[PDB]
Design a protein around this ligand. Sequence first.
Ligand SMILES: CCC1=C(C)/C(=C/C2=NC(=C\c3[nH]c(/C=C4\NC(=O)[C@H](C)[C@H]4CC)c(C)c3CCC(=O)O)/C(CCC(=O)O)=C2C)NC1=O
Ligand SMILES: CCC1=C(C)/C(=C/C2=NC(=C\c3[nH]c(/C=C4\NC(=O)[C@H](C)[C@H]4CC)c(C)c3CCC(=O)O)/C(CCC(=O)O)=C2C)NC1=O
Ligand SMILES: CCC1=C(C)/C(=C/C2=NC(=C\c3[nH]c(/C=C4\NC(=O)[C@H](C)[C@H]4CC)c(C)c3CCC(=O)O)/C(CCC(=O)O)=C2C)NC1=O
Ligand SMILES: CCC1=C(C)/C(=C/C2=NC(=C\c3[nH]c(/C=C4\NC(=O)[C@H](C)[C@H]4CC)c(C)c3CCC(=O)O)/C(CCC(=O)O)=C2C)NC1=O
Ligand SMILES: CCC1=C(C)/C(=C/C2=NC(=C\c3[nH]c(/C=C4\NC(=O)[C@H](C)[C@H]4CC)c(C)c3CCC(=O)O)/C(CCC(=O)O)=C2C)NC1=O
Ligand SMILES: CCC1=C(C)/C(=C/C2=NC(=C\c3[nH]c(/C=C4\NC(=O)[C@H](C)[C@H]4CC)c(C)c3CCC(=O)O)/C(CCC(=O)O)=C2C)NC1=O
Ligand SMILES: CCC1=C(C)/C(=C/C2=NC(=C\c3[nH]c(/C=C4\NC(=O)[C@H](C)[C@H]4CC)c(C)c3CCC(=O)O)/C(CCC(=O)O)=C2C)NC1=O
Ligand SMILES: CCC1=C(C)/C(=C/C2=NC(=C\c3[nH]c(/C=C4\NC(=O)[C@H](C)[C@H]4CC)c(C)c3CCC(=O)O)/C(CCC(=O)O)=C2C)NC1=O
Lengths: 147, 65, 161, 161, 161, 161, 161, 160, 160, 160, 160
Amino acid sequence: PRARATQPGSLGAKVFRLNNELPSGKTTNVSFSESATQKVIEAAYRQVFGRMVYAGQRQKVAEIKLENGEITLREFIRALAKSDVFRNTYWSSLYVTKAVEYIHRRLLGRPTYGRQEINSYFDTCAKKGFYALVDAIIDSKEYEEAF
Amino acid sequence: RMFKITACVPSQSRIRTQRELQNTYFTKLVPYDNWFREQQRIMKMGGKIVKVQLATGKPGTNTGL
Amino acid sequence: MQDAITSVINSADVQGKYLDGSAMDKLKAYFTTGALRVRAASTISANAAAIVKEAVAKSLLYSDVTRPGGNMYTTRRYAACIRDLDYYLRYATYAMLAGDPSILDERVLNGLKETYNSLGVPVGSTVQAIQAMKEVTAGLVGADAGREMGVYFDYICSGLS
Amino acid sequence: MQDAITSVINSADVQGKYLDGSAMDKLKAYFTTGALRVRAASTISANAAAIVKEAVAKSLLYSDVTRPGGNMYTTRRYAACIRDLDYYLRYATYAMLAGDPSILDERVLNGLKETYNSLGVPVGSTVQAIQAMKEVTAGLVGADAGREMGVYFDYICSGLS
Amino acid sequence: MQDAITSVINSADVQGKYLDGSAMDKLKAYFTTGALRVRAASTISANAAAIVKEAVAKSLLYSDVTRPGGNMYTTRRYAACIRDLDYYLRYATYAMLAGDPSILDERVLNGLKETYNSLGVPVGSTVQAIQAMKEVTAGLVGADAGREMGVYFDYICSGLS
Amino acid sequence: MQDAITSVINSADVQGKYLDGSAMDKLKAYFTTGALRVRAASTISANAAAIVKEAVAKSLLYSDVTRPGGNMYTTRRYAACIRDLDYYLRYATYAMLAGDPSILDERVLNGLKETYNSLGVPVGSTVQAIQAMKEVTAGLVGADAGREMGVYFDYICSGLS
Amino acid sequence: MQDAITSVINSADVQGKYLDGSAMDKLKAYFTTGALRVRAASTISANAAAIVKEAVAKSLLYSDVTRPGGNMYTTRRYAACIRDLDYYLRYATYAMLAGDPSILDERVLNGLKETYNSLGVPVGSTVQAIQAMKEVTAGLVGADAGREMGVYFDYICSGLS
Amino acid sequence: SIVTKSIVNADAEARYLSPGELDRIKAFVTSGESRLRIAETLTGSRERIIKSAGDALFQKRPDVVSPGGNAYGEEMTATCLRDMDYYLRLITYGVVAGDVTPIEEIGLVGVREMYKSLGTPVDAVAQAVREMKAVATGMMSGDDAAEAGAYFDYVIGAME
Amino acid sequence: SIVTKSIVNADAEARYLSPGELDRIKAFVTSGESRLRIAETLTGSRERIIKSAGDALFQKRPDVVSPGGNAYGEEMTATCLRDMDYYLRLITYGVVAGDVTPIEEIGLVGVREMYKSLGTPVDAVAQAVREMKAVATGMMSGDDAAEAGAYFDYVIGAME
Amino acid sequence: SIVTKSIVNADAEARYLSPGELDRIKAFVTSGESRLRIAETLTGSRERIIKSAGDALFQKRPDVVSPGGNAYGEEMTATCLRDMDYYLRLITYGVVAGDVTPIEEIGLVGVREMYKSLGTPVDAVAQAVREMKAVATGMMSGDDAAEAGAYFDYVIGAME
Amino acid sequence: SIVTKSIVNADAEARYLSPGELDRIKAFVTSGESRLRIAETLTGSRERIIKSAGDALFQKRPDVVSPGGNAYGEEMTATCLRDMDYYLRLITYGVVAGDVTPIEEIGLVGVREMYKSLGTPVDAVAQAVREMKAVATGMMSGDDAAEAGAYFDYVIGAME
Ligand SMILES: CCC1=C(C)/C(=C/C2=NC(=C\c3[nH]c(/C=C4\NC(=O)[C@H](C)[C@H]4CC)c(C)c3CCC(=O)O)/C(CCC(=O)O)=C2C)NC1=O
Ligand SMILES: CCC1=C(C)/C(=C/C2=NC(=C\c3[nH]c(/C=C4\NC(=O)[C@H](C)[C@H]4CC)c(C)c3CCC(=O)O)/C(CCC(=O)O)=C2C)NC1=O
Ligand SMILES: CCC1=C(C)/C(=C/C2=NC(=C\c3[nH]c(/C=C4\NC(=O)[C@H](C)[C@H]4CC)c(C)c3CCC(=O)O)/C(CCC(=O)O)=C2C)NC1=O
Ligand SMILES: CCC1=C(C)/C(=C/C2=NC(=C\c3[nH]c(/C=C4\NC(=O)[C@H](C)[C@H]4CC)c(C)c3CCC(=O)O)/C(CCC(=O)O)=C2C)NC1=O
Ligand SMILES: CCC1=C(C)/C(=C/C2=NC(=C\c3[nH]c(/C=C4\NC(=O)[C@H](C)[C@H]4CC)c(C)c3CCC(=O)O)/C(CCC(=O)O)=C2C)NC1=O
Ligand SMILES: CCC1=C(C)/C(=C/C2=NC(=C\c3[nH]c(/C=C4\NC(=O)[C@H](C)[C@H]4CC)c(C)c3CCC(=O)O)/C(CCC(=O)O)=C2C)NC1=O
Ligand SMILES: CCC1=C(C)/C(=C/C2=NC(=C\c3[nH]c(/C=C4\NC(=O)[C@H](C)[C@H]4CC)c(C)c3CCC(=O)O)/C(CCC(=O)O)=C2C)NC1=O
Ligand SMILES: CCC1=C(C)/C(=C/C2=NC(=C\c3[nH]c(/C=C4\NC(=O)[C@H](C)[C@H]4CC)c(C)c3CCC(=O)O)/C(CCC(=O)O)=C2C)NC1=O
């Protein structure tokens, strides 16, 4: 449980980090920084939604706030997951328990462990709703320790 | 309602293969509704908070935020 | 985050010596206080909601804050106020158990000042509410542990002001 | 992130012209340096751990920092110190290979100053350690590439101070 | 996920034996075909959207599936169909480069039949679309590169059926 | 349950169209391969028990699954394993004769995964047993008849996994 | 997850009855055996790695499973095997302390058969490894503590088989 | 101490302290006198422990005192005994803390990295703390020797 | 290998192979002949490599063959030379594949857990691979010794 | 045993057993269950005790296994481990009997004369029983380790 | 250099220089920059090479630093490192010469006779130049390491 944060090498999926922090005022034309930031935004779009979303549907306001550097990658993934296209795709078409399970597999990278964990998240879905479900998944200590 | 904050957060217990200058000097924009929770998180790691200020709508807005 | 024990170990560690007899003296002082610290902590944990409601009923209720025009007017601000008071009481209980106010300087008073300036929270009403809560918990759990809670509530007020 | 090549292309691009002969002159200057840049980079990559241990043994070891009372006392702070030195050497090798200190201004000296002020890291000891590492790598890989590493280590020190 | 090299090494390792002459001959066969694989992969990366749209223009256009009632009817379904065909061409390019279809049944053919059977996607029409994609890319890259593309296209059609 | 002829007729009927030239070419392909299918089916009907016992002698014998604790341990479990392998070979022969794997997912792969998961049957060991059965029968009937047997054996292994 | 006390309370509560004399006698039996359970748990916590490595040295070493082709072949598979055996010993210690095997089928035996059947792990060889672990720890802690360990070891082997 | 660890456990689980760990803190409070006695006897005889353990280590592993080894010379052997002094000091801190966490914070995070830098063989340091453990438990009474040997055992476990 | 690593690294990024990765695969494809020559050099003389490296190891670290060590006795020394043979075989696999994912993905992931469960000093295993590297790079030309010593270097680095 | 010693000590004195001796026999009779548990702990894990104690002994005293020492060679080291097995068996007998008259009356009376006639250093045998005591008291609970270490203590004391 | 050796070869054979050895002198002339780079890197890091090689030699062969041995004491160890300095200096001279002949003229004729006079074990000096070779080729790039290792190899061959 100390090694939740250790990334797998060549035996699992690759992990994308936003470590370069896209920093520039008076940026070079052939700056390599924006291109890697586009790679990371690409990666967040296809890990949250699964696929690259259609061209009219992607959020440009959260991409712009990330490339300017005011929000973190965690809050950017929270703004991707609390969007209308994500909830119309995954939360509004499905059963509530199946939506809890699939949103947990999308945002935490793993299926749920047991019943307490599902009685606690679907209670957050009960008294508060889907937005607090995304907020409680992104809050969790496994998210903080893993990513 | 949104708090601009900047802060310094040190690594707690392990050496780091990554660079993490962006992890150590965090300046970001935290909305109001999650600010209690994110403050609690910064205090739970142990790092200090250097600045807190809300750059959005005025303190005092009972209707409309 | 340090106890009395961890601060003793830390101080003996910066200068580099082993445990001397004066460190053992501080440690036995901590233990003989710590038994009643445990019983006072259980009493405060049992009655926290009544303590907070008596604190706000003592100081904040029939003023301009809980009235219109104050920062405690709406139910959003009232719920935030009760949550702020509960957090002050809980962290004071943690500092009472540890025997060190380093947790209050670490987690409570870290950026609380500037957000209290930026949201427009009155510092004086909060300080009055904390002092009312202080003698409420002093009348609840007893005299010596009342003093214990007193210096940690005063630490919170001094970091706030 | 720009090379000598990317900075030449970038400068010819802002004013809007094509490649002139002076740009080709800078490019051939970069290539005739770049062959020995490659061999010096392989030599530094081979001996990085010995370079860092000789740097700390030269300057930081028998001072107050590696002693108690300094910022290098605990094993946590020692491991962070060795990691900081390894990162300085690695980014200096990247800047030597690219022929441009834009990476040092981009990734190293971005927020390193304010976290060094906030954690209380001594700037002078770090600068002495980097200069000791500079003539350690100069005696290792040779004279001209020693100067190459010298201006990039000096760039790191000037961004630090 | 393993290419021809990793599968040869895995066979020799599960044996526990060293690389004998048959493994050397298999690796020599892969190291002779690799340049043709590289050039065909570049030529396929050139014309992704053209190969996909020519496959739809050959098979799926002007049939019942683009008419009302078909599973390719709406713009959402058309965009998802173009996405699925781009996936098939991209992973066939990957399996051509590796020289082993392990990526296809690891990452395409894993739950694809059950997904298409749950959605109501016609499997025969998409098999004909993949066959027309194979015919177009074999017209693009030539005889033998088209054959070594078509073996993995036939692998995808066989696992889908 | 449909062969290549019935699937071609079903496609042309769901279209509502007559049999065009592509359907004629598909039926000509089946009517050319049918004699080879007949001879391979006779050769497989010759040696059912030999192919099954050689598959067990290759994979499952002398491993842990025939030892105590294995799922192939008892004589009842051994007889049921021989019965299951005879089923796989018989239905692979049927799917080879029809030229369409519709009988396999209609009558073998329907509830087979859930049955094996409820009983505790290892799916990987039985997949290896079916693969060895495929290897033995491809050694029996030749290259191309072994390939057109192995496509349905791979269909059974893919639906089982 | 329930010990002997919680299961007795759950039976008396599902009855809705008070604790009669049979429940008192069951709890007296557990409160007599608890000190022996504590001492055996300390003795097992002493020698975790020794019991695990003696179990591998008795059963799994120098057999086919550590040779090429075995499921315990690679260093990754060896480390995962040592991890699995440490899990079995740790949870058998927990079930010995609770005096009830509810934690074993709640948290070990839940999806263990399907996991091992999907991975290809031999169940008979790991059952023999758990039996040798039981034999070693029963040699360690004595007759009756070894028996009350072996009842939960036999529970794990029965649920695995 | 045990109280900081119980507090960070109740914090991460976002609840109050359970009565089990309240009873744990109360039992730690009552056992303060025994741990004070253990740390008292260890702070008493630290020089004798260090001298016997260093000579036992040099008798067991002579590679460190050989020419070409790490601890060669007067000052190098004195610094070796200084490092053993630091580790026995952290042992006393963890003995009086009731937890291994000050030993972790002060001297267990990067010892492999820094001893890779200095050239010290870390298994030799594990042997040194093994000899210090054997000598200190030889000095103590058996129950208190078990308590101090738990922390010594933790240090040699985090070493190797 | 190189092709697996490039395919996976383009695969997570949802893109095709970049042209720089493609000329990387092309350069590895051209250097495969020299890789196969180094592999035949390492394969054909494995007896002398294992024998001389075991001799120099037991000369260098005699305590593991002395009574009390792990590799004491006939069958234990035979198992020790077998483990060295395993690591030389993985060295040959990593030489052919052009990357260390065969070596790491077979015999370096849980090597510390395995050799801790066996009771083996891992530094003496690092010395065994060091002597194997000395005998092997004493057996080849310069660039061949550098290219094989890269993978030997990775194995000794992944030990400690 | 205890009963033999009490009977003999009352027997020379021409008196019956005094009531204090009788409650001594009664307390030993009640503690026989814990004695049998310690005996099963020592009996069931004799392989690891003898193996690890021989390993730590030859690590500690390498000259007796070096050429020139007593236990040099295969059969001599086997006889050395056999002598250690004899002493662990006598330890088990003394644990059950509640007194050291099995250990003394079997294998401690002429131990100096025997090991002087064999040419054996008796201090190295005391180190062998010391390592056996370390492995055995590392294997039990606290009071069990103290009760077994009493008899191990008697054997090492009767050596020197 | 290579030119003096080609001249004395053409002199003893009483003919002009062949175009083969004219092409050899021309190739030596063009490879002057590579040998200048090798000798430059060796003259750069001579102290680090000498310190690591001397500590590796003293770790490998402790007979010279033992009492009664040759290099016993501060001045004797310093003179040992001085002799290693002379040999690395001659290595650089032969590296820049393109031939082994200045190493032969200055330090290879009577080293067996003079070290028979001083009492220095010559095989220990061969081990010292072996460690200097291993360290210097560890520093260099592999092709240049092969070139310098040719001259180092010649020196240890003329030693033993
Ligand atoms: C890629 C560019 C990059 C750099 C350089 C970087 C440095 C960096 N150095 C840090 C700490 C540190 N750096 C030092 C440095 C030193 N020891 C001394 O006393 C000397 C003055 C100097 C040794 C040469 C120390 C002691 C700490 C830890 C202080 C503490 O937080 O306890 C930290 C805080 C987290 C940590 O503990 O590591 C960061 C992020 N981060 C980056 O992304
Ligand atoms: C606009 C949003 C809003 C709400 C809801 C609000 C409630 C509110 N209710 C109060 C008291 C109270 N409210 C009640 C009301 C009730 N108890 C009963 O018996 C009745 C059933 C129920 C009336 C419906 C009582 C009895 C008090 C006095 C409580 C006390 O003094 O302990 C007070 C304390 C006095 C003050 O500061 O004015 C506030 C702030 N204030 C607000 O600004
Ligand atoms: C663990 C330490 C810790 C503390 C203490 C903390 C306090 C904290 N108090 C806040 C607000 C507040 N705190 C108060 C306080 C008061 N009501 C008054 O008028 C009195 C003066 C006082 C009641 C005693 C009020 C009214 C607000 C909300 C003002 C607003 O944003 O609308 C907020 C902004 C988010 C929120 O609405 O809750 C934070 C983060 N955060 C922390 O992490
Ligand atoms: C990389 C491996 C991989 C594949 C191949 C894959 C396919 C896949 N195709 C899908 C849908 C689809 N696929 C098709 C495709 C077709 N239907 C037709 O009529 C044509 C015959 C055929 C195209 C040639 C259509 C129309 C949908 C949308 C179904 C719907 O929206 O109801 C879906 C449903 C969810 C979503 O659209 O985004 C998945 C998961 N997923 C994968 O991970
Ligand atoms: C409390 C946590 C803590 C630790 C662990 C610590 C270690 C530490 N060990 C040091 C040196 C050393 N430590 C050793 C020790 C050893 N080498 C051997 O041969 C022996 C086997 C082994 C002794 C167990 C040696 C030889 C040096 C000097 C190394 C040198 O000068 O190159 C130094 C350098 C001198 C100084 O600044 O005091 C530090 C800081 N300091 C700390 O604050
Ligand atoms: C290909 C990756 C791979 C490795 C490395 C591997 C190692 C491995 N080494 C073993 C034993 C061993 N390996 C050694 C080796 C050594 N001890 C020493 O002192 C020397 C330093 C060192 C060798 C030079 C010894 C002594 C044993 C026997 C351990 C015992 O009997 O308890 C065993 C248990 C018996 C067996 O089935 O062989 C395995 C599985 N297996 C693998 O699949
Ligand atoms: C139950 C009481 C009892 C004891 C103790 C006993 C000892 C005993 N030890 C013997 C030999 C021996 N015992 C040792 C033992 C040792 N040498 C060492 O260096 C180690 C320090 C040490 C063991 C750890 C050796 C080396 C011999 C062979 C002596 C020889 O061959 O000359 C022999 C002669 C051969 C034989 O018949 O076994 C006896 C009788 N016999 C007994 O009945
Ligand atoms: C360039 C050709 C050349 C060589 C070879 C050379 C050798 C040389 N070695 C000397 C001494 C020595 N050399 C050694 C060296 C060694 N003994 C050891 O223990 C080590 C293993 C070995 C080091 C490799 C020692 C110990 C002395 C001092 C001997 C004495 O004082 O009796 C001296 C005497 C002091 C002096 O006049 O500088 C000379 C001349 N001088 C030369 O000009």
